Structures are given as structure tokens and as C-alpha cells.
Amino acid sequence: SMSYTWTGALITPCAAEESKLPINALSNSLLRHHNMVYATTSRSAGLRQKKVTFDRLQVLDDHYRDVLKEMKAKASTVKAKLLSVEEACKLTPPHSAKSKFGYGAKDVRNLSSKAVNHIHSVWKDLLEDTVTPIDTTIMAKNEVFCVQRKPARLIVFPDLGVRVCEKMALYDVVSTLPQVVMGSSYGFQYSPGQRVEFLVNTWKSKKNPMGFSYDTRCFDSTVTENDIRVEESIYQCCDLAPEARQAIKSLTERLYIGGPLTNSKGQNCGYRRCRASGVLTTSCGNTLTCYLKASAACRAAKLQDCTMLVNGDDLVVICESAGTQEDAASLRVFTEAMTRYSAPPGDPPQPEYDLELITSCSSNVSVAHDASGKRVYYLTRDPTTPLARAAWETARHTPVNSWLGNIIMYAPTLWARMILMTHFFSILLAQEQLEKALDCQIYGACYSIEPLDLPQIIERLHGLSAFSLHSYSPGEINRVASCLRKLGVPPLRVWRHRARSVRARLLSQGGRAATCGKYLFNWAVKTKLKLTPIPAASQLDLSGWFVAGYSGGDIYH
Ligand SMILES: CC[C@H]1CC(O)=C(C2=Nc3ccc(NS(C)(=O)=O)cc3S(=O)(=O)N2)C(=O)N1Cc1ccc(F)cc1
């Protein structure tokens, strides 16, 4: 069937949408070439609608069913609990979209009777009705990029009340099932250090290692009614309260399989018959469906000793090489299989023989040396987008601070240390907002983070070596430098000079601030200070951090 049907009605915004990078006093110190940076708006949605709207054909063979059977066998070992209204409300982001029924995110959060009562009736209606499609809102995301222009991505989501109900029935399942089903292949269990560790070990466990990433063209669109039914049958294998079983089935038929699409003004835009991007099961459903399809496609393509790493729709395979010709013909069969299962590629997959040339989760492996000169691997990426978005966040307050997300996830990198840390700590010092808790996203989940805990966070996710890393690869250095020339970002010798200031200013303040200066900026000085384990680092509660993915799942820890 068709992924989408359109009435002709326009996808509308809520407020005004800026496409031009906003400029303030701090902007120029980070980025000169302001015309290179832009944010997508709802005005480019018409182009996105064309792209993601196609007919899907699915041809399921024996490999497909075998893998599914294996997945169900493990899923049936899981016991998941029904969450209470209260517990589910505590999981709602403070900046989450208001309900059409008179209450908002903060009303839900502090458990007002108006919020709690409507959630109960939405739940009750879920138990009684397993057929009536549920209203969803379609919006256009505002994402910032650098020109190379991309049309906006679409977000489809049900009303707040339903989102809380999703959490009640499905929060435990989506948090626990994927690891049990997919084992070490499930990538959202991994912190950066563990992921690097796992990619490298996997690369080393192969006599002649070959690797490739598989980019599906618009994954959400390729997902069929079948895939959503299949993913529900997986959920139903769990030991579940009879109320959870009813709700899950109901949400599958009424929400996850499809439904009408309503713009922010209240007009009907059309109908969806594919994956909604703003439901709780978006991440887990895509991960299960991607894993199922790929594993089966490995059997069809007869890939020798393949280890898979899956994060939602992001997929990387590492296996034994049969030589460049056989690898090329293997990947075609893989691609044909995936295409038959309704997961065609965007770019054709290419086999890589160097681990560092492989991109997965927008990240590639690279190597540096620590204080002992001892080789250490870390994940990095092209810094073009993270810097473009930092530039935007230098001039505009945002609900999600991507700069912090990038520092947390890319702390060991050259560009996050010298540019991102230096720039933003400079900003926080001038405002005296070091103690101020900030919101960011890790694996789709929203986190309130105090910047002064960054040293303790980095020690736990990357290890101490992250504060010492030096002698970066020529290839990494070339990419970082090429980005700054393109963007008009000051050279890295200017950033070092600025870092000396930021460090001293932090040290002069003592307490947790001096701790930040000591660890985060030890690189900037020739006369190096010794970096021992942090006194109160093991105090921070880092549970929930790397259990599951929750992209568009409206989650807050
Ligand atoms: C700053 C971004 C950083 C952290 C991060 O949240 C992600 C991420 N990766 C994803 C990858 C794929 C999806 N696809 S989806 C929509 O769930 O089907 C969703 C996410 S996500 O929304 O859950 N977030 C991500 O890919 N990265 C890069 C990364 C990943 C692992 C790592 F160890 C280091 C950096």
C-alpha cells in the first residue's frame, strides 16, 4: 500500500520559523560564514512529502520467518510491568507538547487532577475499543544544517494523554525487550567507550575483516502494516498483565499501524500507513524490524561470520571478507533481500576494509594516544553539523542543547574539546550560569544536566584518557581543519589561547569549577597537571543512561 495519502491541506507551523542563523555578540567568535548555516521550516514540507510517499511491496521468505521465530523465543523470556499513571507522568518532558484537552506538560508532571483524570479515560477507552484510529498531529521539524539544502523532516505524534498511556503499557517492554532479543547486537545498551570497545573487538575477531553500513532510504516510510503487526506479536510474547496486552493490541491497531494526520491548525492532511516517528515504540520497533530484516538478509547473502550492530534504523555489519569482488556481489544480494523485505537503500552500500572509514550512528572510529603514549580508540564524526548547531544555540535558547549532547558523546574528540568546550564554558562564565541545569538528549531521551558534572560524566563514559588524548590522526585533523575553513571558524591555535583564559577563570573560582578547569582544559597548557580519578565521580547516578533508545518517544529521565 501507499506510505501516505495527502488531502492537499498544508503542514502548518505553531510559531514563526527562522531559516536564517540568528546573530548576536558571540556569533562571530565561533563562525564567520553565516550564510552557510540554515534551519529547515514547514515551508519545505511539500518536498519531504514527495520523497517519503511511495508504494511498498513485501516478499517474506523462509529466512525472514526463521529469524522472527528466534526473536520470539527470547522475547517470551521477558516479563514487563504495567506502569502507574504517576510513574508515566514523571517520565514526561517539561517541554512536551500540550494536550488538545485543556492540560499541558507541567500539569502532567506535577500530577494535577485534570491531567490524571483524562489519562484514565484515554486508558479506559483503549481497553474497550480496538478499532477506532487515534488522532495524530503532523509537524515539520526545525533542524539546523550546513549547505553542501535539505527539506524538513516530518514528526507524527498522538495527543499527550495517549503518550502517557503508551508509557503505562509499553515503557518496560521497550526498555528491556531489545537487549534480550538482540543481545550484543542492540547498540543502545552501549556507552561510547563500550561501543568503541565492541566495534574494535568485533573488527579484530575477523581473520579478514570487511564492514559496511546500510542506509535505508527513509526507514519510517518503508515500514509496512505487516512489520508493525509482526513487532506487536513480538511484544505479546512477553509475560504481561492482561491490561497491558489489551492496551498494546489497541495501540497497534489504532495508532502504530496507521491513522489520520492533522496539521497544527486542525485540518486533515491525509492518512498514514507506515511508522509514526513520534510514538514510544519508534526506536524499539525500528530496531527490531531492522535487525530482523538484516539478519535474514545476511543468511540470504551468505555472509561469513557477520556481527551486527543496530540502533533503530542505523545498521552496521562486520564480517569475513571473500575478496573485493565477492564482497561486492554479496552486498548486492543483501541489498536485493533488504529491498524485497521493503527496506531499499539510499546510497548503495559499499564494502570498507578500514574500520575508520565506516560510519555508523553518524560516528566513525579513530585513534589517538594518551599520557603514556598508549594507543586509545574513540568515536568521532565530521564536526560540520554539530558546529552549525552550536552557532544557532549561541544566538538562540533551544529546548534541547545539542552542544552539550555533542560534548557528552564526543568528549575525546579534537573538535569537541578545543572548540565546543572552550566556547560554551566561556559563555557560561560570562553569564554566571555554571550551576544552571541544562536539557539535552542521549539516545532520544531528555536529560537535565548540570555542566559542572561534565568531568565526572566523561570519566564514566570514556575513561580518564579522554582528558589526556593527543597526537590525533592526520585524517581526523584534515577533516576538522577543512570544516573550520568552510565555516569560518577561528583556527585551533586561537581556541587554545581562549582555553587558557577559560581554564584560569574556572580555577580561580575553586570548587567544582576548578575541577572543570583541571580536567576539561588540561590540554591547553604546556605545564601539565596530573589527572587522577575524581573524588566524587562515582556518586552520579548513571542508570537509565544506556539501556534503550527513545527517539521521538517523549521520554525524560
Ligand atoms: C550526539 C549524538 C549521539 C548520541 C545519540 O543520541 C545518538 C542517537 N542515535 C540514533 C540513531 C538512530 C535512530 N533511529 S530511530 C529514529 O530510533 O529509528 C535514533 C537515534 S537517537 O535519537 O536515539 N540518538 C547518536 O547517534 N549519537 C552519536 C553517537 C552514538 C554512539 C556513540 F557511542 C557516540 C556517538
Q: What is the DSSP string of 305-330?
A: T-EEEEETTEEEEEEE---HHHHHHH
In the chain, the amino acid numbered 338 is M
Cβ 364 vs Cβ 208: under 8 Å: no
439 is in an annotated binding site: no
The CATH number that applies at residue 196 is: 3.30.70.270
Are 403 and 508 within one domain?
A: yes
Nearest alpha-carbon partner for 82 in 190, 179, 169: 169
Answer yes or no: is the C-beta of 314 below 6 A from any ligand 1 atom: yes
- CA–CA separation, 282 vs 287, rounded Å? 8
- CA–CA separation, 540 vs 365, rounded Å? 27
Nearest alpha-carbon partner for 213 in 310, 315, 286, 288: 315
- CA–CA separation, 410 vs 161, rounded Å? 35
Are 267 and 250 within one domain?
A: no
- CA–CA separation, 542 vs 539, rounded Å? 9
Are 420 and 486 within one domain?
A: yes
Q: Which domain holds residue 87?
A: 56-132+159-186+224-257+274-280
Closest atom of ligand 1 relative to the 290 alpha carbon: 18
For the chain, the residues before each gap (C–N > 2.5 Å) are 148
Look up cell 558571540; give the residue.
26
- CA–CA separation, 515 vs 506, rounded Å? 8
Cβ 483 vs Cβ 33: under 8 Å: no
- CA–CA separation, 546 vs 124, rounded Å? 33
DSSP bridge partners of 216: 345
Atom 29 of ligand 1, residue of closest alpha carbon: 361
* Secondary element (H or E) of residue 287: helix 282-300
DSSP bridge partners of 4: 272
314 is in an annotated binding site: yes
Method: X-ray
CA of 413 to the centre of ligand 1 (A): 17
Kindly tell me the sign of the dihedral angle through the C-alpha atoms of 147, 148, 152, 154. negative
Are 329 and 246 within one domain?
A: no
- CA–CA separation, 261 vs 160, rounded Å? 16
- Joined grid coordinates for residue 153: 523532516
**CA torsion angle for 321, 326, 327, 333 (degrees, to 10)?**
-130
In the chain, the amino acid numbered 365 is V
DSSP bridge partners of 15: none
Q: How many CB atoms lie within 10 A of CB 176?
A: 18
Are 77 and 2 within one domain?
A: no
User: Resolution in angstroms for this experimental structure?
Assistant: 2.6
Are 306 and 425 within one domain?
A: no
Cβ 289 vs Cβ 176: under 8 Å: no
Are 1 and 148 within one domain?
A: yes
Which long-range contacts link 297-306 to residues 24+ away (Cβ below 8 Å)? 297/63, 297/334, 297/337, 297/338, 297/341, 298/334, 299/63, 299/66, 299/67, 300/61, 300/63, 300/333, 300/334, 300/337, 301/330, 301/331, 301/333, 301/334, 301/337, 302/330, 302/333, 303/330, 303/334, 305/206
- CA–CA separation, 117 vs 111, rounded Å? 10
Are 369 and 320 within one domain?
A: no
Atom 35 of ligand 1, residue of closest alpha carbon: 409
Are 481 and 351 within one domain?
A: no
Domain limit, last residue, from 318, 343, 363: 363
CA angle, 395 as apex, 23 and 415 as ends, to 5°?
105
Contacts of 2 (CB under 8 A, 6+ apart): 53, 54, 55, 273
Are 181 and 250 within one domain?
A: yes
Nearest alpha-carbon partner for 462 in 531, 553, 390, 382: 531
Q: Which letter does DSSP use for residue 127 in this model?
A: H
Q: What is Dmax (Cα atoms) for the chain?
A: 70
Ligand 1: residue of 316, 404, 409 to mutate (most ligand atoms within 8 A of CB) is 409
- CA–CA separation, 255 vs 276, rounded Å? 8
Are 107 and 172 within one domain?
A: yes
Answer yes or no: is the C-beta of 220 below 6 A from any ligand 1 atom: no
* Secondary element (H or E) of residue 510: none
Nearest alpha-carbon partner for 293 in 64, 66, 56: 64
- CA–CA separation, 85 vs 287, rounded Å? 27
- CA–CA separation, 431 vs 557, rounded Å? 27
The count of domains in the chain is 4
- Joined grid coordinates for residue 541: 547516578
Coil vs helix vs strand at 133 = coil
313 is in an annotated binding site: yes
φ/ψ of residue 175, rounded to 5: -85, -25
- CA–CA separation, 241 vs 81, rounded Å? 7
Are 109 and 95 within one domain?
A: yes
Please give the distance of CA 208 from its chain centroid, rounded to a whole number. 31
Look up cell 556481527; give the residue.
307
Give the number of residues written for the chain: 557
- CA–CA separation, 381 vs 534, rounded Å? 28
